[PDB]
């Protein structure tokens, strides 16, 4: 009798108790006089989000209509100011609405001017009221010696960009690679910095242990990488001693070319045919939850369409990572495709016949034959579709000259529509394309090194381009 009464008392005490987390005035339906529409509350549907899900339909026919309308948004980065600065080695990662950016700032001439600054800056990609996804660089790092920090590479993970670079007291450690130490630095930079952070805003991660395997030196090499959970995948390159590069010479596609040799694609895996080291691409694994001081594991890329380790870019587009590798040797067609497996790295390289990079005399653009060359430029492509497998990036439309940067949109066998970003004789060298979503529109921000012929300096010019929807 009284026990069932007490059970009713306890059940009332358990159910009608409102122990709840605090209300959120924006989530709940709010009804103020003369209101604004409530339409949808979803995070990362308000600002800039990655290419994920199902974006708006891009124009898919090949057309002669100028429909890509690029917007020079270069003022959003410290590439402007005094024109006595030559601005070298840019970098542009973009995850989830946050960017990273890094250049070397030399005073005077591009070749021997005094190195002012290596600004390593992260920030936020957003629409800054000008109806164009601009950049807003807040947290900026600059090392105590900008002549030793080379080949940075950036990955965003939980309110930080992590930027991995090479510490080289012997110059560009591709070029003086036999005397490089292999030492690397990891700079962790908050994308929304706290006032008075101290360890939150800018932190230096000490990498005292690298997992290479059969490689003697590894190095981050390329703009941007990915995160997969708690694991960072810096695009990279392995320095393999050429005498240990086991490679059966009959594998070389010497047929359909009367002038190649069975030595060529073995030889042109290094920067010069008697290179002591062979540049094989890959990734660097940085799993954050390995512990205190997580080690860096090199992942060698698989030998399908193997060429020399050129600057690489693994980028997360529409759910599955896409790897890009520049063509710094004879395989001058563009070498990129969806990542089948990340460790071990196996890329389904797209059979791409139409997009190539210019190189100098030995291996020009539209060259397939195995020649010995270390030639070509990082002209990047970003994946903006998978049902039709469309991509976009800025490519230098000339056979042998580093000129005419053209933002173009292409299949594996067809270019759909272009937009030349400058004049035809505008010397441009390294373009970095990242695309994202802004109100479910595919906007692509395309950094492009441009050499100003007047000021005799190299200067990155950003081009926030909206991938159009009709024609």
């Amino acid at each position, epitope marked *: 009798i009284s026990q069932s009464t007490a059970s009713i008392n306890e059940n009332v005490n358990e159910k009608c108790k409102f122990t709840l987390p605090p209300l959120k005035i924006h989530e709940c339906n709010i009804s103020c006089p003369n209101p604004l529409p409530f339409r949808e509350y979803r995070p990362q549907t308000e600002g800039v989000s990655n290419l994920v899900g199902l974006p708006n339909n891009i124009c898919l026919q090949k057309t002669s209509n100028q429909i890509l309308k690029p917007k020079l948004i270069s003022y959003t980065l410290p590439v402007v100011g005094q024109s*006595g*600065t030559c601005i070298t080695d840019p970098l542009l990662a973009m995850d989830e609405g946050y960017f990273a950016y890094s250049h070397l700032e030399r*005073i005077g001439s591009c*070749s*021997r001017g005094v190195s002012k600054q290596r600004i390593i800056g992260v920030g936020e990609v957003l629409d800054r009221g000008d109806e164009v996804p601009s950049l807003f660089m807040t947290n900026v790092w600059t090392p105590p010696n900008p002549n030793t920090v080379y080949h940075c590479s950036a990955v965003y993970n939980n309110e930080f960009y992590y930027v991995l670079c090479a510490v080289s007291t012997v*110059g560009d450690p*591709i070029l003086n690679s036999t005397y490089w130490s292999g030492s690397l630095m990891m700079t962790r930079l908050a994308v929304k910095p706290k006032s008075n952070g101290g360890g939150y805003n800018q932190h230096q991660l000490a990498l005292r242990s690298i997992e290479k395997g059969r490689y003697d030196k590894v190095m981050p090499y390329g703009p941007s990488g990915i995160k997969q959970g708690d694991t960072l995948y810096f695009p990279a390159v392995g320095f393999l001693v050429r005498t240990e590069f086991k490679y059966n010479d009959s594998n070389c596609p010497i047929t359909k070319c009367q002038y190649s040799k069975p030595e060529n694609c073995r030889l042109s895996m290094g920067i010069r045919p008697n290179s002591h080291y062979i540049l094989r691409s890959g990734l660097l694994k940085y799993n954050l939850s390995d512990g205190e001081n997580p080690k860096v594991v090199f992942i060698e890329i698989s030998d399908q369409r193997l060429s020399i380790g050129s600057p690489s870019k693994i980028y997360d587009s529409l759910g599955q990572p896409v790897f890009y590798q520049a063509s710094f040797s004879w395989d001058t067609m563009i070498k990129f495709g969806d990542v089948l497996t990340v460790n071990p790295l196996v890329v389904n390289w797209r059979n791409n016949t139409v997009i190539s990079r210019p190189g100098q005399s030995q291996c020009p653009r539209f060259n397939t034959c195995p020649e010995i060359c270390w030639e*070509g430029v990082y002209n990047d492509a970003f994946l903006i579709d998978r049902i039709n497998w469309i991509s976009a990036g800025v490519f230098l439309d000339s056979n042998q000259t580093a000129e005419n940067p053209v933002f173009t949109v292409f299949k594996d066998n067809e270019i759909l529509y272009r937009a030349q970003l400058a004049s035809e004789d505008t010397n441009a060298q390294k373009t970095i394309t990242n695309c994202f979503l802004l109100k479910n529109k595919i906007w692509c921000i395309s950094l492009v090194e441009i050499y100003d012929t007047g000021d005799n300096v190299i200067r990155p010019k950003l081009f926030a381009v909206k991938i159009p929807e009709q024609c």
Partner: antibody
Amino acid sequence: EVQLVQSGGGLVQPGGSLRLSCAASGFTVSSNYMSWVRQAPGKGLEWVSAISGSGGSTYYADSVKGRFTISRDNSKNTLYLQMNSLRAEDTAVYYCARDREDIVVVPAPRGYYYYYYMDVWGQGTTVTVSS
Amino acid sequence: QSVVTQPPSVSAAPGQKVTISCSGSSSNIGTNHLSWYQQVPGTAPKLLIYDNNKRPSGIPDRFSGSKSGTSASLAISGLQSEDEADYYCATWDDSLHAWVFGGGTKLTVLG
């Protein structure tokens, strides 16, 4: 036509200072680097310092670092050289000359080519560091 | 500094061929191109070769340049009396951030 003219050389007591000038004709020194090359009687050419074309970069040779100071006046179109703490090994003929650098952008991982030379040399006046 | 070496003095008959070598490190000659300067004594130095093989406007063809590895060359064929001077190879060191002139080749033509 295109020519550099020195002035302000001459006899100076050791440890002192002498400011050399470089009257520029035919061009503007704001657009190009400029450099000082000396030659002691009995030796070859030795580079001394360099001012940047537009920008504020001052290079110095390792034996003259902290003693010589290069600057220029764009309005006067004249490269200067403030030489200070003159050792007797600065007894030479100082030649102002521009360093015209030619850079093309090449589709290569090295990026740009940059062959690099001095073409327009001044007459060169004598710094005599003695009693 | 990196003192780029030359033959100090080579000599040949008029009309003959002489090649003036210029050897230094890899940081200055191997990375950066080299330039050549003849210098009659008592006279301003004169630009002869730049980009290892090209000439400024107003030089006869008998001054030939070369660069091989960390070494360079200045070939002078058909010697005349006014080609007797000191010959200076000059280049920029990307390490020292400096011009690097050669030690000087007192070419002794006859004439």
